[PDB]
Amino acid sequence: MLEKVLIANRGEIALRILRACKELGIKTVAVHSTADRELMHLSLADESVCIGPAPATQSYLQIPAIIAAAEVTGATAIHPGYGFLAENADFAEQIERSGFTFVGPTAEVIRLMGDKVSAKDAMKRAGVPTVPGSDGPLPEDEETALAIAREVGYPVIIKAAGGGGGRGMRVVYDESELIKSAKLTRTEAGAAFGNPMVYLEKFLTNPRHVEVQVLSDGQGNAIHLGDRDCSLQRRHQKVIEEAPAPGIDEKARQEVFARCVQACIEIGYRGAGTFEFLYENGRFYFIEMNTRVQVEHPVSEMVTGVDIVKEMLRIASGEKLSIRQEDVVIRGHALECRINAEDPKTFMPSPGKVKHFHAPGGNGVRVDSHLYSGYSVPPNYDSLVGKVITYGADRDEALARMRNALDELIVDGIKTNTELHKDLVRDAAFCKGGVNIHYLEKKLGMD
C-alpha cells in the first residue's frame, strides 16, 4: 500500500480523497492556496503545505510548487482529483520523471483521450460506436468543410479537439454559416485551450448524457460499475446526476459495457475512467472519455457498493483489481444534487461566510462537502460547495429522499442553487425520467 499521498486539489474532492486514504492507512499531504487556509481537510491531514497565493494559476495549477511539496514531505504518490492538473499530461509525466506515483492513467493515455479527435478515432478501432461527424478534424478548406457537413447532415456542431468544461462548441443550423462559425470556434479554441483544431459532429436534438464508469488495473483487468445519467445541464455543465440511467435498452447498454471494458484492456487504461456517451433512440454514441475520477462518482458507488477512490489508490499502489464483474451488482437507484454557492436565478457565484451549515441525514442520504459553520467560501475557485446524494430501492424512492434531504439542508450566509434542486425533484418531466440534455435550459426557459 502507498506510503503517503499528496492531494493536489481542494474543496470537497480533496476531503473525499483524504477519507479514502485514511481508510486505507495512507499518510496524507494537503496542498493549499493562501485563500484556502480554512479548508476542512487541512485539519484532518497529516501534513499541509501552502503552495501559492489565491489565484489558481499561481497555486493549484503551479506544477513546480506541487512537485516541491511532494519532495519536502516525502510523498510517494499524488492524487490529482478532478480538474486542475488531473488531465494535464505534462503534470503526470513530470511527477513520474521525479519518481512519484500518479494516481491515474499513463501520461500518453491522458494525451490520447485528452485530444478529442484521436479519442474518437481510438474508440472506432475498439469497435465502440461514435457520434457521426468528420473523420478527424474539420479542415479550413471551404470546399472540403462544406462537403463534410453536407454528408453528416445539418444541424451540426463544431467542437474543439482540446475542449473541456463544456466550452469551445458552436451549433450550425444551415450551411451559410458553417465556415464563419468554424473560423470563430478555432480562434476561441486557440486561446482557451492552446489548440485551434475543431471537429464536426451531428448535433443530436434528443439525446441523454449517459456514461460508463470503469476501473482498470493496468495489469490486464478492467470492470464497469454501471452507468450514470447526467442530462440535466446548464451551459453543458452538469447539475444533477443519477445511477443507473433509467429506461435504457438493456441490450444496447450491456453491449456498450463490454465494448468499454474491452477498450480499457486494449489501450492500457490504469485507474478510474468514464466513457461519455450520447444516447438517442436506443443507441449509444461516444463523445469523450474522462481520464480521472468524476464529480459524480458517488451515485455509482451507491448502486454498486464499490469505493472508486479506494480502488484508484489500490491500483496505483500496484494491486490487481480484486473485484470481478460477477460480483458487481447494480442495485437500487441513486441521485446526486450539486450544491453550488451561486445565485439560484442569475448563477453568479456567491462567496461568503457560512454562518450556519446543517447537513441532511437519515436512511439513504449521503453528503460529500467540506462546508462547516464559520467557514468562508473564497471567490477564486469553482462554485461547488457540496454534493447531496440519495439512494433508494428505486428511482421514486431516491427522489423522495432528495426532497427530504433538500428540506433539511441549511447553508446560511450565502446563496445556493438549493431551491432550483427542490423544483427539479418535483418537476413532472424529470420525476417521469429520461429527459434530454436540452431540457433544463428549455425549462428555465419558460420565464
> How near is the Cβ of 70 to ligand AP2 at its closest, in Å?
29
> For ligand AP2, which residue has the nearest CB?
437
Min separation Cβ 404 and ligand AP2, Å = 29
Q: Looking at beta carbons only, is 236 or 432 nearer to ligand AP2? A: 236
Question: Is residue 61 a known part of a binding site?
Answer: no
Three-state secondary structure string covering 18-85? HHHHHHCCCEEEEEEEHHHCCCHHHHHCCEEEEEECCCHHHCCCCHHHHHHHHHHHCCCEEECCCCCC
For residues 217 and 288, which CB has a smaller minimum distance to ligand AP2 in the complex?
Answer: 288
Closest to ligand AP2 by CB, 165 vs 220, is: 165
Q: Give helix 308-316 / helix 11-23 axis angle, nearest 10°.
A: 70
- 422 annotated to a ligand binding site: no
**Annotated binding-site residue? 202:** yes
Least distance CB 310 / ligand AP2 (angstroms): 26
Residues labelled as active-site residues: 292
Instruction: Report the nearest approach of ligand AP2 to the CB of residue 226 (Å).
Output: 18
Q: Is 234 annotated as a binding residue?
A: no
- Amino acid making up residue 389: I
Least separation in angstroms between residue 154's CB and ligand AP2 is 12
Cβ atoms of 274 and 290 closer than 8 Å: yes
Q: Closest by alpha carbon to 282, among 237, 245, 230?
A: 245
**Nearer Cβ to ligand AP2, position 211 or 301?**
211
CB of 389 to ligand AP2, least distance (A): 20
Q: Which is nearer to ligand AP2, 231 or 418 (CB)?
A: 231
- Quick one: three-class SS letters along the chain? CCCEEEECCCHHHHHHHHHHHHHCCCEEEEEEEHHHCCCHHHHHCCEEEEEECCCHHHCCCCHHHHHHHHHHHCCCEEECCCCCCCCCHHHHHHHHHCCCEECCCCHHHHHHHHCHHHHHHHHHHCCCCECCECCCCCCCCHHHHHHHHHHHCCCEEEEECCCCCCCCEEEECCHHHHHHHHHHHHHHHHHHHCCCCEEEEECCCCCEEEEEEEEEECCCCEEEEEEEECCCEECCEECEEEECCCCCCHHHHHHHHHHHHHHHHHHCCEEEEEEEEEEECCEEEEEEEECCCCCCHHHHHHHHCCCHHHHHHHHHCCCCCCCCHHHCCCCCEEEEEEEECECCCCCCECCEEECEEECCCCCCEEEEECCCCCEEECCCCCCEEEEEEEEECCHHHHHHHHHHHHHHCEEECCCCCHHHHHHHCCCHHHHHCCCCCCHHHHHHCCC
Output 36 or 227, the one with its CB closest to ligand AP2: 227
C-alpha span between 115 and 59 (Å, rounded): 25
Annotation-wise, does 27 bind a ligand?
A: no
Q: Minimum distance between the CB of residue 124 and ligand AP2, rounded to whole angstroms?
A: 16
Is 142 annotated in a binding site? The answer is: no
With respect to ligand AP2, which residue has the nearer C-beta, 149 or 437?
A: 437
Q: Interface with ligand AP2 by CB under 6 A: which residues?
A: 131, 157, 163-166, 201-204, 209, 233, 236, 276, 278, 287-288, 437
Residues annotated within the binding site for hydrogencarbonate are 238, 292, 295, 338
Residues annotated within the binding site for biotin are 338
Residues annotated within the binding site for ATP are 116, 159, 165-166, 201-204, 209, 236, 276, 288
Residues annotated within the binding site for Mg(2+) are 276, 288, 290
Residues annotated within the binding site for Mn(2+) are 276, 288, 290
